[PDB]
Paper text:
Gaucher disease (GD) is the most common lysosomal storage disorder which is caused by inherited deficiencies in β‐glucocerebrosidase ([name], GCase, [name], EC 3.2.1.45). [name] is primarily responsible for catalyzing the degradation of GlcCer by hydrolytic cleavage of the β‐glucose moiety from the aglycone to yield free ceramide and glucose. This is achieved with retention of β‐anomeric stereochemistry of the released glucose unit through a Koshland double displacement mechanism using Glu340 as the catalytic nucleophile and Glu235 as the catalytic acid‐base. Here, we report the design, synthesis, and structural analysis of a range of cyclophellitol epoxide and aziridine inactivators and activity‐based probes (ABPs) for human β‐glucocerebrosidase ([name]).
To further understand the binding of galacto‐configured cyclophellitol aziridines with rhGBA, a co‐crystal structure with galacto‐configured 4 was obtained at 1.80 Å. The resulting complex revealed that 4 covalently modifies the catalytic nucleophile of [name] in an almost identical fashion to gluco‐configured reagents 1 and 2. Specifically, 4 reacts with Glu340 via trans‐diaxial ring opening of the aziridine trap to form a covalent complex in the 4C1 conformation with a bond length of 1.45 Å. The key difference between this galacto‐configured complex and the gluco‐configured analogues is the axial conformation of the O4 hydroxyl, which is still able to form a hydrogen bond with Asp127. Indeed, the hydrogen bonding network of 4 is very similar to that of gluco‐configured 1 and 2, with both O3 and O4 able to form hydrogen bonds to Asp127 regardless of whether the sugar is gluco‐ or galacto‐configured. The only notable difference is the absence of a hydrogen bond between the O4 hydroxyl and Trp381, presumably owing to its axial conformation. Overlay of galacto‐aziridine 4 and gluco‐epoxide 1 provides an immediate clue: the O6 hydroxyl of galacto‐aziridine 4 has rotated such that it points ‘downwards’, perhaps to avoid steric clash with the axial galacto‐O4. Thus, one possible explanation for the cross‐reactivity of galacto‐aziridines but not O6‐substituted galacto‐epoxides, is the requirement to displace the O6‐hydroxyl for covalent binding which would not be possible were the O6‐substituted. Therefore, it appears that the placement of the reporter group is important in controlling the selectivity and cross‐reactivity of cyclophellitol‐based ABPs. In combination with the ABP labelling assays of rhGBA, this co‐crystal structure serves as a caution when assuming similar configurational specificity of cyclophellitol epoxides and aziridines, which evidently does not always translate to similar glycosidase specificity.
Author numbering: 1 to 316, 318 to 343, 345 to 497
Write the structure that this text describes.
């Protein structure tokens, strides 16, 4: 283990400074002995996933807050956690010296880091690209004879994905999403702005676009990468908006329904990539449950849809009415958060050491977990201090900020807030009930690991310390305190 090297940039908390020869890391995982619990703590004051251990007490008295585990109240199984290998992320990582690149990838993907097991891969260019390109820019190439991967794939994204998978002990799942089709498949003949596919589902435009998904999967498979899932389109509602400034492809829910049923479903099912799962929506949860009803009430579409992908950008938060109602209507269709991102209109894109932006991530993950969501995918894995590069200056924050001039990278509070979940909630973990004895300002969630062991995350977004006890009837009582502006993860064996 190496501790955080803290640095202040004058905001509420510190970043952890890494370079070619030093980065903060964990010792190999270890389980706490029966009758004991592990505690990982991060605080605004500067603690970064610090490990301590306490006893599980046989009984408890007091009127203080009690959180009772309900281990027989069983909910969703977790797919996992990760982020996006954009052109911007890969260009930033590969601008560091080889040893600093390795410590950055280890921070995310190693058991000595925070154990990411998902990577979202854009299909060609998005706003976090330094140019607009698709895989098939030769006009009217319906047979896709000029389909090919540019250097952004073969020199930046694919080599970093291979290195990520080599560092991971957990199996990593790849998720692919397109922003735009070739312009010659679109009504507006442009990568951006208001525009859909030409014609109608079933026709040559729609069959070509479905075949483009298979050519992408074919080209990645030639580079020995296989996908867990693809989304039907990144943010289909964006391409319905006049002057939408970057790469988009408009679909109404009806258009998405018919494209999946007539073209994408059958084309993927008849390919060598038929095991790849399809997620629908990949957009703001405010479009639910309407979008799920339109697509999934058509059995010709539903038979091809594994899941619903949601974005957090416009959450701010009717989770019950959107995520909850959707689960109720379609309980066997998983909900997956495919894009989360932070910033206030009066704040810069990157705020080095923002505890507030950390708290937004952990709060979002807890709310999602409490409303059936199985997985949570950050946006850019890494950005520069301006929040780029980005061909349209749509600059945002990232858990890791690379300073190429200093051969340095900064781990933001967001990285640690994500880590409190990603490191301690492996694939197959199941959310279980956790009931509070009184109204409280805390956010908490409980899950059980595949092996039966318990995990609880407790976030305190208030300034006040909150004494609390966790009751697990199988083992006893965890007496602890949630300090103001802290996040804790608690682990214990149940037998
Ligand atoms: C990379 O970061 C490490 C850790 O902050 C730097 O090593 C420290 O350097 C300072 C100043 O020379 C020493 O006082 C510390 O004792 C060092 N710590 C360790 C663990 O070695 C290192 O200098 C940085 N590298 C560069 C190129 O700036
Ligand atoms: C399209 O493909 C043909 C045949 O392989 C090739 O000769 C030509 O250079 C390609 N066009 C572009 C723009 O790459
Ligand atoms: C499905 O795949 C088979 C075998 O590759 C092929 O012969 C057939 O034409 C395909 N069907 C359609 C409708 O594309
Ligand atoms: C989701 C989100 N708006 C981020 C913001 O950084 C980015 O624009 C993605 O392209 C969007 O899909």
């Amino acid at each position: 283990a190496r501790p955080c090297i803290p640095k202040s940039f004058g905001y509420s908390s510190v970043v952890c400074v890494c370079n070619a020869t030093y980065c903060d890391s964990f010792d190999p995982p270890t389980f706490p002995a029966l009758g004991t619990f592990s505690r990982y703590e991060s605080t605004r004051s500067g603690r970064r996933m610090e490990l301590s251990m306490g006893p599980i007490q046989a009984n408890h008295t007091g009127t203080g807050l009690l959180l009772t585990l309900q281990p027989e109240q069983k909910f969703q199984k977790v797919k996992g956690f990760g982020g996006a290998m954009t052109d911007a992320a890969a260009l930033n990582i590969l601008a560091l010296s080889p040893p600093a690149q390795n410590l950055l990838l280890k921070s995310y993907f190693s058991e000595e880091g925070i154990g990411y097991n998902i990577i979202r891969v854009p299909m060609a260019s998005c706003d976090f690209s330094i140019r607009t390109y698709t895989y098939a820019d030769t006009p009217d190439d319906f047979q896709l004879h000029n389909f090919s991967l540019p250097e952004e794939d073969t020199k930046l994204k694919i080599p970093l994905i291979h290195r990520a998978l080599q560092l991971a002990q957990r199996p990593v799942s790849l998720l692919a999403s397109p922003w735009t089709s070739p312009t010659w498949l679109k009504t507006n003949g442009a990568v951006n702005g208001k525009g859909s596919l030409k014609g109608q589902p079933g026709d040559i435009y729609h069959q070509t676009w479905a075949r483009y998904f298979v050519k992408f999967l074919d080209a990645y498979a030639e580079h020995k990468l296989q996908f867990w899932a693809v989304t039907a389109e990144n943010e289909p509602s964006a391409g319905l908006l006049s002057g939408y400034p970057f790469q988009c492809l408009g679909f109404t829910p009806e258009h998405q329904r018919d494209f999946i049923a007539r073209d994408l479903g059958p084309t993927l099912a008849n390919s060598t990539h038929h095991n790849v799962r399809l997620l629908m929506l990949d957009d703001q949860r405010l479009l639910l449950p309407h979008w799920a009803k339109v697509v999934l009430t058509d059995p010709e579409a539903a038979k091809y849809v594994h899941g619903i992908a949601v974005h957090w950008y416009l959450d701010f938060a009717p989770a019950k009415a959107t995520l909850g109602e959707t689960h109720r209507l379609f309980p066997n269709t998983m909900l997956f958060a495919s894009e989360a991102c932070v910033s206030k209109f009066w704040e810069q894109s990157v705020r080095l050491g923002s505890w507030d932006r950390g708290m937004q991530y952990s709060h979002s993950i807890i709310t999602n977990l409490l409303y059936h969501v199985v997985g949570w995918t950050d946006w850019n894995l890494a950005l520069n201090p301006e929040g780029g590069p980005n061909w349209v200056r749509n600059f945002v924050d990232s858990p890791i900020i690379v300073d190429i001039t200093k051969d340095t990278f900064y781990k933001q509070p967001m990285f640690y807030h994500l880590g409190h979940f990603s490191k301690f909630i492996p694939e197959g973990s199941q959310r279980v009930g956790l009931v509070a004895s009184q109204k409280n300002d805390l956010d908490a969630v409980a899950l059980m690991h595949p092996d039966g062991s318990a995990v609880v995350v407790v976030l305190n977004r208030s300034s006040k310390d909150v004494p609390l006890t966790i009751k697990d009837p199988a083992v006893g009582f965890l007496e602890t305190i949630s300090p103001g502006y802290s996040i804790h993860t608690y682990l214990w064996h149940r037998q």
